[PDB]
Amino acid sequence: PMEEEEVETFAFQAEIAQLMSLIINTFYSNKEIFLRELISNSSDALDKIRYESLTDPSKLDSGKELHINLIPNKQDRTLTIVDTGIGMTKADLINNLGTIAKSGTKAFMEALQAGADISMIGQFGVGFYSAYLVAEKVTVITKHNDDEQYAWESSAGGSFTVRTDTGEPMGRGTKVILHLKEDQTEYLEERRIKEIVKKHSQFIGYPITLFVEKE
Ligand SMILES: Nc1nccc(-c2cccnc2)n1
């Protein structure tokens, strides 16, 4: 029997779309910082569940292990960043990933137009968008304790989709799947991933594991 699934397609808030076009259509040195931004978000999400768990231990029923997994796939050219953090509710997704204006957007774009390094993106509260430095398309699968699992996706172009995810369940946390541009395949190499994690993400207070598919 044919399965039916509801999708909702949203327009990014005007300045957000503007920022995304800037990131994608300009040359930037040190695009590697995309990984630090994503790992910081996972780190923050892991903190949230950890502190919530002190008042309500049952919030760890969905998995007690607090950590990050990096999974490069040379076959389909994706780099996946997975955490067991707090995850995102539907409202979280709509508010954090596109529809609601961010107070730092205008500031960051002015900063970029003036020649700022993309590395500064994080401080403006829009770090997640650096993913588009290396990915033509980004998929976010997420599960929060009092909500169901969702799939958010965008190849930019001013829109994104949100849907209830019928794919493989994760206990709780967020999985970011970067579908890498053709010339950004170095981020699928084990040596290069270890290099950038070592360089930019050494104060994550949760374990990180890199999984390498046998040659
Ligand atoms: N990894 C993770 N976990 C929870 C939330 C987020 C997130 C994404 C994009 C923007 N703000 C927060 N990322």
Swiss-Prot record:
ISGylated. S-nitrosylated; negatively regulates the ATPase activity and the activation of eNOS by HSP90AA1. The modification N6-acetyllysine is found at K48, K74. It comes from the Eukaryota. It is found in: Nucleus; Cytoplasm; Melanosome; Cell membrane. Changing G87D: Abolishes ATPase activity. ATP binds at N41, D83, K102, F128. Molecular chaperone that promotes the maturation, structural maintenance and proper regulation of specific target proteins involved for instance in cell cycle control and signal transduction. Undergoes a functional cycle that is linked to its ATPase activity which is essential for its chaperone activity. This cycle probably induces conformational changes in the client proteins, thereby causing their activation. Interacts dynamically with various co-chaperones that modulate its substrate recognition, ATPase cycle and chaperone function. (Microbial infection) Seems to interfere with N.meningitidis NadA-mediated invasion of human cells. Decreasing HSP90 levels increases adhesion and entry of E.coli expressing NadA into human Chang cells; increasing its levels leads to decreased adhesion and invasion. This is Heat shock protein HSP 90-alpha. The lineage of its organism: Eukaryota, Metazoa, Chordata, Craniata, Vertebrata. The gene is HSP90AA1. The chain holds residues 11 to 225 of 732 of the full protein.
